[PDB]
Amino acid sequence: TQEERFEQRIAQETAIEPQDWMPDAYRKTLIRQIGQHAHSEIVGMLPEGNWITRAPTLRRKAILLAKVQDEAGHGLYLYSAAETLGCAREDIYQKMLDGRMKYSSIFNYPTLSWADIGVIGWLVDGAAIVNQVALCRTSYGPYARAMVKICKEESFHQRQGFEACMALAQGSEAQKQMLQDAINRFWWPALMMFGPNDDNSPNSARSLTWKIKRFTNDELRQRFVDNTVPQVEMLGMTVPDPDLHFDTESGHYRFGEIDWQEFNEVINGRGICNQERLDAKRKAWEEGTWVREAALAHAQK
Amino acid sequence: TQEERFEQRIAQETAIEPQDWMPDAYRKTLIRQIGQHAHSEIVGMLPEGNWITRAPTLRRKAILLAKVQDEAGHGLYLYSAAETLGCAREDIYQKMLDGRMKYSSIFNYPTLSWADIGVIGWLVDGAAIVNQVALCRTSYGPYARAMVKICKEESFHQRQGFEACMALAQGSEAQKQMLQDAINRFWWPALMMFGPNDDNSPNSARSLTWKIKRFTNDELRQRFVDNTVPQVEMLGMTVPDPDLHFDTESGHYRFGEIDWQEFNEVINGRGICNQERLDAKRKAWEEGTWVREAALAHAQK
Amino acid sequence: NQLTAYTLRLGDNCLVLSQRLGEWCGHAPELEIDLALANIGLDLLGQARNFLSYAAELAGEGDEDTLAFTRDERQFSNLLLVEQPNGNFADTIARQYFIDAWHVALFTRLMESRDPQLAAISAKAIKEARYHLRFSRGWLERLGNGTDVSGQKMQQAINKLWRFTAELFDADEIDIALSEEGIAVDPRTLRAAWEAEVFAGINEATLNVPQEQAYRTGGKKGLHTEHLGPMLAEMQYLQRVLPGQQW
Amino acid sequence: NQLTAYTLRLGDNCLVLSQRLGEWCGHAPELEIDLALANIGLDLLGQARNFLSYAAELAGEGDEDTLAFTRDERQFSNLLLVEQPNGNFADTIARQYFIDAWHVALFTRLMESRDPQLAAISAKAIKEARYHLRFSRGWLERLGNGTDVSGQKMQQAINKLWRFTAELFDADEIDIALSEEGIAVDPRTLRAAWEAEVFAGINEATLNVPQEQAYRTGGKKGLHTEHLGPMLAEMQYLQRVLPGQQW
Ligand SMILES: CC(=O)SCCNC(=O)CCNC(=O)[C@H](O)C(C)(C)COP(=O)(O)OP(=O)(O)OC[C@H]1O[C@@H](n2cnc3c(N)ncnc32)[C@H](O)[C@@H]1OP(=O)(O)O
Ligand SMILES: CC(=O)SCCNC(=O)CCNC(=O)[C@H](O)C(C)(C)COP(=O)(O)OP(=O)(O)OC[C@H]1O[C@@H](n2cnc3c(N)ncnc32)[C@H](O)[C@@H]1OP(=O)(O)O
């Protein structure tokens, strides 16, 4: 009845809480998912940070600083939620540095223009929101509640990102080209944020059963594509996909095949920025040592 | 007759050579002068280095790299000449870093525009050349011969510096303003290169007697002003000096009073870049340690 | 034009200092410091944006953006203290601390201005300055009274930067003409407030106040160190490449 | 166009690397190194001017300056290896080694090109390249077969640049089609000569040819690391502020 009552709570949809009983594999898979979610928020600071000092207007710059401040904040919220399941913040953070845990594939791509920042703000935050909204009804309560607080905050910046893109869409010929190019370098990497196929998803069986995950990786990806394409046509831009078109009979946008061979390299640490990301965090950690140690020895007097 | 034969050489003007006899104070004062001459060549790389990565054209950039390569070279030539009098290169270089020896007052000023580089190339090299030409007939042979080799090389770059300034004098309104402002921040500091007054020159008595120095600080400075002013009028620029005008009856350009109180701060290490310059060299020396040490331990196998 | 220039200096301090903290994003010793530094940089940029908009208004042409992106290093007028490089974490803290103590002293007196908007802006600004000063004074003592290694580091950061403090109390023709109308704060008067906060702060960390007489000034009349030029080169690139565009 | 594309790749390699060495000026361990470094940079810049000047000619528009100064990071076609930070002295040595070895191999064969100008440029260039390889090898042995510290920093300098060596032998549609006409050198045929030199050099330094497979390409088609944008901002700043002038 231990396992049996749990099964019902899930099934009736009563939110699981920190000091409830839960299967050992359910706890471990949630530390894994929530940890990596926080890792994403932290790593995600780097591509965006890269353009702070270079942002084109004081306004756009102020918004970008706001955004990065809110990302650190969301990381901390997610580590709190993580720690309610028995793990240590510092323990899993060290796993991220070592590469023993992942973070979102998306931040292994570089910001090579200002348009990049807008497109991350619009598509990449858009893709993360589509996924986070669907996580608002996740079985675990601290997770699902964090997901609500976050979607509330993050979608303000998403609209900011979109407005930045709108400015380029409507600006000089040179501004339009800049955006088109950012879209081109980010569209496919955005789709991969949702994870592999339904045929190649080892976690998907359990996650759906325990209502940790509410929709399949392909389902959410399809939702994203359906929301986003009209947003692209609105800006008078295109998506780098010859096979993309609307399919009357199914009422979805049918879209092209993902380069899974790239996806596999990126998650296995051989993407573009992958190393320059871990290096950056590893460096911030090691050079920061004397500072944390000083803070400790001071709190002792 | 030891002291007596020396007196005659110097007089009829037979150059002195490394393994001759010379007064102990004549040796000490020449290590001082020639050492500081080399120090100048090395420090002088920093203000010019500052603009390499930023130079406006590949041509101008190449010239600037040439110039800085030739300054290092002239430093080494001057240390060789220095070492012929019994000192060690590394010994006096360490004194430079400690601030126990000087280098030219002029390099404690910062390069704040591209025009600065041209004006250094034209006025500051010009002022060094006026001084070095007069040193071609210095009593000591290794010094005097070094001065010939150098003036030959350095005046190619001086004409380059002047041509760079010519390009600004003849360019857009914005380019002309840039040069005028470089001139304005460099004219007075250039005049101080020649050193203090004839009334305040402790070294001058002996130096002139031993024909180490051929003309007084004021005499050379007067020469520089006389050569340079028509060059300024040619460019259609002005000099930041209300009192400057041509004096028929003496046939010289009479010019304004030098701010000696500034001069005294600059030489005593309290100028604009003094600290930044020694810091830069001190850092290059300390961080370079492991490299010199590795080179040593390798030459041992 | 005097008032205009006086405004610009205050805004320039904020804008340039802001850029410096930008560089720390993603690289802090911990996430809590990262977020703190972002939070400070954001306040300062807000302050910059306010002062800049007032100057533009006073001049009656351009705006915050033209003033930040289309001026060259010779026309910037930030203090020399803010343009210094981040260095290690102490070099950042030390700079921040001398700057906060001075902002807390400045804005206090400056909300009392006989210029409405300078007083109006300083009123909003003093609220943040104290939070900055709590943060920076905090770490100053955490590092000063930390380990052997951190204390030496914090001492040498304090020393390296000291010579630029002279400019905080330097009163030129513009300060004087405007401080004789109670518009500007005369910077010589701020000395005692600053010194009383900073000597005690340093002493309380078991470090020593530097003994060199601080002597570097110049930022305000556009005579900068060699650090500003490449900062601006980075800050303005996009605007230089594509001028007069809505972003 | 394909020939232009190629010239630009070669020219951009030299120009970018050139910029990197510019930063070392004044800051080296000893003066001789400073002078050595200034000189290598001047050769490389020299090489860049000829390749770009030719490119400008194939194009029939602009010149070495327009190509150097009015293109953004998405247009530069340099190797990703040339843009990496200078780091510590061993970092700079490692990069210069991998590069000169490559240049030696490449220009030795490019003086054969059926395009006279390319051949003419590489004939001048190979002379310099051999001096550079002497220099960069010079220090590889000195630091690997030196003190424990130095051998160690050197081992790491090599490890951290290694992933980029992949691009020296990557051949794309332009390298292939121009190589069939015997104008270009297929980068793939350069592997042999490069490995023979480098593998030897590293092992003679008593170090390790890294086990990890290299995978970083893209520079050649405008997809760079996050280091180039900031170089181009520092390098182009003035031309951007004041375009269309003579200097
Ligand atoms: C932009 C931002 O601020 S955060 C961006 C979005 N971030 C997140 O969604 C992080 C939280 N995680 C999740 O929502 C889920 O893990 C999903 C939907 C991304 C993936 O589904 P899962 O059930 O966890 O994994 P799945 O079985 O589909 O895939 C197998 C493996 O690839 C990983 N993976 C899938 N997509 C990615 C990706 N985009 N980046 C990195 N790893 C990924 C999975 O985590 C799993 O690895 P693991 O077991 O070592 O942790
Ligand atoms: C740009 C370049 O590449 S190098 C620039 C020019 N550099 C040089 O000429 C360096 C070689 N030195 C000389 O020619 C001479 O020392 C002079 C003409 C500069 C000065 O005359 P001196 O007889 O040496 O000194 P003098 O009695 O006139 O002045 C007293 C002190 O002021 C110093 N001094 C004078 N001018 C300068 C200056 N511009 N910068 C620094 N120190 C100076 C003198 O060196 C002396 O100090 P010291 O005894 O500790 O070395």
Side-chain angles (χ1 to χ4, degrees), chain A residues 1-2 6-7 9-76 78-136 138-301, chain B residues 1 6-27 29-76 78-158 160-301, chain C residues 1-111 113 115-126 128-247, chain D residues 1-172 174-210 213-247:
Chain A
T1 335
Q2 274 287 41
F6 178 88
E7 308 284 336
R9 241 168 199 171
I10 302 264
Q12 12 185 81
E13 235 132 87
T14 300
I16 317 297
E17 297 289 330
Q19 61 307 108
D20 284 5
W21 183 90
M22 59 191 79
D24 193 75
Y26 173 96
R27 192 178 290 267
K28 268 164 200 165
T29 196
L30 272 182
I31 294 162
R32 188 201 55 91
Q33 189 169 312
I34 298 161
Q36 291 167 171
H37 209 130
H39 296 338
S40 296
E41 300 285 330
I42 288 185
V43 169
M45 283 174 78
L46 298 161
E48 250 141 342
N50 195 228
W51 271 87
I52 291 176
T53 73
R54 273 178 294 169
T57 69
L58 297 190
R59 202 173 101 75
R60 279 307 167 201
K61 189 185 228 90
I63 296 163
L64 183 49
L65 261 167
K67 181 163 206 292
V68 175
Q69 145 163 64
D70 289 7
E71 273 182 33
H74 300 150
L76 294 172
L78 288 170
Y79 282 128
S80 281
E83 281 184 306
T84 76
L85 290 157
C87 69
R89 180 190 134 169
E90 45 289 326
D91 177 62
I92 58 157
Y93 187 79
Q94 202 65 39
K95 284 191 185 163
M96 195 265 283
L97 300 175
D98 280 342
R100 283 182 285 137
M101 289 171 82
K102 299 162 167 63
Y103 56 91
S104 191
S105 69
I106 194 60
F107 304 120
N108 302 301
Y109 295 74
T111 52
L112 312 171
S113 86
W114 165 254
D116 289 36
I117 302 295
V119 169
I120 287 173
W122 164 42
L123 307 184
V124 174
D125 274 57
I129 277 159
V130 157
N131 172 265
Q132 284 161 176
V133 158
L135 278 190
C136 277
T138 188
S139 65
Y140 193 50
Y143 198 16
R145 279 187 314 273
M147 288 302 94
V148 154
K149 183 156 288 151
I150 285 170
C151 284
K152 210 214 272 63
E153 300 168 26
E154 264 193 26
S155 70
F156 169 70
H157 289 300
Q158 198 275 330
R159 124 81 47 180
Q160 298 281 31
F162 184 74
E163 274 181 16
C165 289
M166 183 48 91
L168 301 175
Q170 295 181 326
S172 61
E173 184 59 23
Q175 278 181 299
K176 289 164 189 186
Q177 276 160 32
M178 202 193 296
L179 175 67
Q180 191 54 76
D181 189 75
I183 288 161
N184 289 333
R185 286 176 288 114
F186 273 92
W187 179 258
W188 288 104
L191 304 202
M192 302 180 206
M193 275 172 84
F194 297 104
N197 276 340
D198 295 343
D199 312 327
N200 306 101
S201 195
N203 305 307
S204 265
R206 275 182 174 156
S207 278
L208 283 159
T209 292
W210 288 330
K211 290 166 167 176
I212 289 182
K213 169 190 274 178
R214 298 317 297 272
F215 293 85
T216 76
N217 294 2
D218 293 342
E219 272 168 340
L220 282 176
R221 171 153 48 237
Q222 179 62 75
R223 228 222 276 303
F224 174 70
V225 169
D226 280 310
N227 298 342
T228 313
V229 174
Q231 270 173 12
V232 172
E233 292 178 328
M234 217 197 113
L235 296 176
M237 301 282 135
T238 64
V239 152
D241 188 351
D243 294 319
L244 178 105
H245 91 292
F246 188 73
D247 173 31
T248 290
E249 206 198 30
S250 82
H252 287 287
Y253 277 95
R254 283 289 168 263
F255 60 98
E257 184 65 29
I258 283 162
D259 178 8
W260 292 118
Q261 220 274 302
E262 178 186 355
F263 179 70
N264 240 241
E265 292 295 82
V266 183
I267 52 176
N268 285 322
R270 270 103 55 54
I272 294 148
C273 297
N274 278 91
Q275 180 99 30
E276 283 122 271
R277 302 288 188 234
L278 290 177
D279 279 13
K281 298 316 287 178
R282 287 206 283 260
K283 187 196 210 269
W285 186 253
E286 285 155 36
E287 286 186 351
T289 293
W290 70 274
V291 178
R292 292 185 306 268
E293 275 176 0
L296 224 180
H298 184 68
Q300 295 173 348
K301 316 164 174 181
Chain B
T1 334
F6 178 88
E7 308 282 335
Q8 268 145 33
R9 287 203 192 117
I10 312 256
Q12 36 181 358
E13 262 167 63
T14 315
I16 317 298
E17 298 287 334
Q19 60 307 105
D20 286 1
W21 183 93
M22 61 192 74
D24 194 75
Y26 173 98
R27 192 178 292 266
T29 194
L30 270 181
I31 293 161
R32 187 200 55 92
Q33 190 170 308
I34 299 162
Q36 288 166 180
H37 211 130
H39 295 340
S40 301
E41 298 288 325
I42 289 186
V43 171
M45 284 172 80
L46 298 164
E48 250 138 341
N50 198 230
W51 270 86
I52 291 175
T53 70
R54 272 176 295 174
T57 66
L58 297 193
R59 204 174 97 75
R60 281 303 170 201
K61 190 183 222 91
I63 297 166
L64 184 45
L65 262 167
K67 181 167 202 291
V68 172
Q69 145 163 56
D70 289 9
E71 274 179 35
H74 301 152
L76 295 168
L78 286 170
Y79 281 132
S80 276
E83 281 185 309
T84 76
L85 291 154
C87 67
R89 179 188 139 168
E90 46 292 326
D91 180 56
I92 60 153
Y93 186 78
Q94 202 65 40
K95 285 187 184 164
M96 192 266 279
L97 301 177
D98 281 344
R100 288 179 285 137
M101 287 174 80
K102 299 165 164 61
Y103 57 91
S104 188
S105 69
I106 196 61
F107 306 122
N108 302 300
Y109 296 74
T111 52
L112 310 174
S113 92
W114 166 255
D116 292 35
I117 304 293
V119 166
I120 291 177
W122 163 46
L123 309 180
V124 174
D125 274 55
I129 278 158
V130 156
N131 174 261
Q132 286 159 178
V133 159
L135 275 189
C136 279
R137 291 297 292 248
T138 190
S139 65
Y140 192 53
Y143 196 19
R145 279 189 310 275
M147 290 299 90
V148 157
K149 186 152 287 157
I150 287 170
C151 287
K152 209 217 272 65
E153 300 172 26
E154 266 191 24
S155 65
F156 169 71
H157 291 301
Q158 200 272 332
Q160 297 283 31
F162 183 77
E163 274 180 17
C165 289
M166 182 50 90
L168 300 176
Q170 294 181 326
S172 62
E173 180 61 20
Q175 278 181 298
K176 289 167 189 181
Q177 277 162 33
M178 203 193 295
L179 174 68
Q180 189 55 75
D181 188 73
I183 289 162
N184 287 335
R185 285 175 291 112
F186 273 94
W187 178 259
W188 290 105
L191 303 199
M192 303 178 205
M193 274 173 88
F194 297 101
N197 278 343
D198 295 347
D199 315 319
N200 308 100
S201 191
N203 301 304
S204 269
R206 275 185 174 154
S207 282
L208 282 158
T209 293
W210 287 331
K211 290 166 168 174
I212 290 184
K213 170 190 275 176
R214 296 317 297 273
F215 292 85
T216 76
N217 299 356
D218 288 340
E219 274 169 336
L220 284 173
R221 168 155 50 240
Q222 181 60 74
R223 228 221 276 300
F224 172 71
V225 172
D226 275 311
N227 298 343
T228 309
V229 174
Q231 270 169 14
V232 173
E233 294 179 329
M234 217 192 111
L235 294 175
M237 302 283 139
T238 67
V239 150
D241 188 352
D243 294 326
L244 179 105
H245 92 297
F246 187 74
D247 173 33
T248 286
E249 202 200 31
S250 86
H252 286 289
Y253 278 96
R254 284 290 168 263
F255 60 96
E257 185 66 28
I258 283 166
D259 179 8
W260 290 116
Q261 220 274 302
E262 177 186 352
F263 178 72
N264 233 244
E265 293 294 270
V266 184
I267 54 176
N268 284 320
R270 271 102 56 53
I272 300 160
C273 310
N274 290 80
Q275 190 69 40
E276 285 98 302
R277 302 286 191 235
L278 287 177
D279 277 8
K281 294 322 285 177
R282 287 202 284 255
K283 185 200 210 266
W285 185 255
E286 284 153 38
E287 283 184 1
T289 294
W290 69 274
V291 176
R292 291 187 305 271
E293 274 180 359
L296 224 179
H298 182 70
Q300 290 173 350
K301 316 161 176 180
Chain C
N1 219 145
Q2 290 204 307
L3 174 70
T4 314
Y6 185 75
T7 299
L8 235 25
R9 294 169 185 175
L10 298 191
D12 280 341
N13 310 315
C14 292
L15 180 57
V16 174
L17 185 48
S18 187
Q19 289 286 126
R20 279 306 175 198
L21 297 162
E23 291 166 43
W24 269 102
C25 158
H27 316 290
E30 315 146 355
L31 232 217
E32 288 86 349
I33 293 147
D34 245 301
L35 177 67
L37 288 177
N39 190 49
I40 298 145
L42 190 43
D43 294 325
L44 288 165
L45 176 63
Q47 286 170 23
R49 296 187 69 196
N50 291 163
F51 280 123
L52 261 56
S53 308
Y54 185 41
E57 203 174 302
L58 289 175
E61 48 158 62
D63 45 82
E64 51 173 13
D65 279 339
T66 77
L67 297 180
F69 292 92
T70 72
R71 283 183 305 150
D72 76 42
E73 92 184 78
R74 278 293 292 123
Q75 304 175 296
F76 259 72
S77 60
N78 51 280
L79 295 150
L80 297 171
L81 206 29
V82 305
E83 73 195 56
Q84 298 314 293
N86 289 335
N88 57 45
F89 187 62
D91 304 307
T92 302
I93 287 311
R95 175 190 62 207
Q96 193 56 43
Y97 184 58
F98 301 156
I99 288 304
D100 293 329
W102 183 81
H103 268 151
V104 169
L106 174 69
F107 299 127
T108 299
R109 305 251 275 96
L110 194 63
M111 53 188 263
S113 167
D115 180 277
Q117 285 107 135
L118 285 203
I121 296 172
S122 295
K124 262 170 292 176
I126 193 65
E128 279 133 3
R130 302 203 204 85
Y131 283 80
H132 297 151
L133 174 62
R134 199 183 338 286
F135 169 83
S136 55
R137 201 222 149 92
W139 278 107
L140 173 63
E141 272 126 46
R142 287 204 261 275
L143 306 155
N145 197 28
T147 59
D148 290 339
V149 149
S150 71
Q152 204 234 232
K153 277 210 165 102
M154 188 70 263
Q155 182 51 76
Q156 266 152 45
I158 272 170
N159 291 332
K160 192 175 187 178
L161 281 162
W162 193 253
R163 63 183 191 274
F164 298 107
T165 61
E167 216 197 353
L168 301 168
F169 315 125
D170 165 83
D172 69 25
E173 20 210 303
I174 277 145
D175 295 321
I176 278 169
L178 288 172
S179 189
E180 254 151 45
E181 296 160 62
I183 288 159
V185 181
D186 168 332
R188 293 167 291 193
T189 22
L190 296 167
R191 179 179 290 281
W194 194 82
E195 281 189 345
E197 160 63 38
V198 173
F199 286 18
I202 298 163
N203 133 72
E204 193 182 286
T206 70
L207 309 165
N208 336 254
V209 186
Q211 272 204 322
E212 167 197 49
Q213 255 250 145
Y215 68 89
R216 287 287 286 98
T217 71
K220 296 154 69 177
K221 317 107 110 63
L223 308 157
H224 296 286
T225 72
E226 275 176 359
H227 290 300
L228 197 65
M231 272 195 57
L232 293 167
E234 215 185 326
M235 182 176 89
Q236 317 188 324
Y237 183 58
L238 187 39
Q239 285 282 357
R240 297 315 181 159
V241 181
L242 292 168
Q245 285 302 142
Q246 295 325 305
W247 303 90
Chain D
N1 189 212
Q2 263 158 350
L3 174 52
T4 324
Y6 190 60
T7 319
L8 253 9
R9 289 179 185 176
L10 295 174
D12 286 333
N13 293 340
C14 307
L15 171 63
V16 167
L17 187 42
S18 195
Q19 278 291 125
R20 278 313 199 206
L21 296 178
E23 306 167 29
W24 265 110
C25 160
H27 308 280
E30 63 214 5
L31 228 199
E32 289 86 19
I33 302 170
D34 258 317
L35 171 34
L37 284 176
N39 186 44
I40 297 170
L42 176 62
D43 292 337
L44 283 162
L45 178 58
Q47 294 178 21
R49 290 186 66 194
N50 292 155
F51 275 124
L52 263 43
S53 271
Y54 187 43
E57 190 193 301
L58 303 171
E61 56 170 11
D63 46 50
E64 51 171 39
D65 291 329
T66 78
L67 292 159
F69 289 109
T70 79
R71 284 176 317 153
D72 59 9
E73 70 178 288
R74 290 275 301 119
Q75 288 173 304
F76 262 67
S77 45
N78 67 275
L79 291 151
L80 301 163
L81 189 57
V82 296
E83 73 202 41
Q84 303 301 303
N86 287 343
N88 60 41
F89 186 55
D91 286 321
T92 267
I93 288 304
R95 176 190 58 207
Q96 198 62 64
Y97 186 41
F98 298 169
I99 278 298
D100 303 320
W102 192 75
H103 275 172
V104 162
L106 168 90
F107 297 137
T108 279
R109 274 214 263 152
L110 191 73
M111 50 198 310
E112 275 158 356
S113 170
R114 289 174 83 262
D115 174 280
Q117 276 73 220
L118 279 201
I121 289 170
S122 351
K124 262 173 278 168
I126 182 68
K127 280 158 201 157
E128 288 144 355
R130 292 187 189 116
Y131 271 77
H132 299 161
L133 180 62
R134 242 204 298 298
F135 176 83
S136 47
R137 204 194 160 99
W139 289 101
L140 182 79
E141 313 307 342
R142 296 211 257 262
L143 303 168
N145 207 23
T147 80
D148 294 283
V149 183
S150 84
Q152 213 272 158
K153 290 218 176 84
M154 190 68 257
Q155 178 62 74
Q156 278 179 18
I158 283 159
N159 284 4
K160 103 180 286 190
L161 286 173
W162 194 259
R163 74 187 166 285
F164 295 115
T165 57
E167 210 190 354
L168 304 168
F169 321 114
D170 158 77
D172 68 58
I174 293 179
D175 301 303
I176 285 165
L178 288 171
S179 152
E180 291 177 340
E181 286 156 71
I183 284 153
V185 176
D186 181 328
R188 276 176 306 180
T189 62
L190 285 175
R191 191 173 292 268
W194 190 87
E195 280 178 9
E197 163 64 42
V198 178
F199 285 27
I202 291 175
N203 288 321
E204 181 189 318
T206 67
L207 291 167
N208 308 281
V209 187
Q213 284 262 103
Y215 56 100
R216 297 286 297 103
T217 56
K220 295 160 55 164
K221 22 163 44 55
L223 317 156
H224 294 258
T225 75
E226 293 185 341
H227 300 297
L228 189 76
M231 298 180 60
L232 292 201
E234 213 191 33
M235 176 175 93
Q236 306 190 331
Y237 178 51
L238 186 40
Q239 280 293 353
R240 298 291 193 178
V241 171
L242 289 167
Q245 297 309 128
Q246 308 308 310
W247 296 92

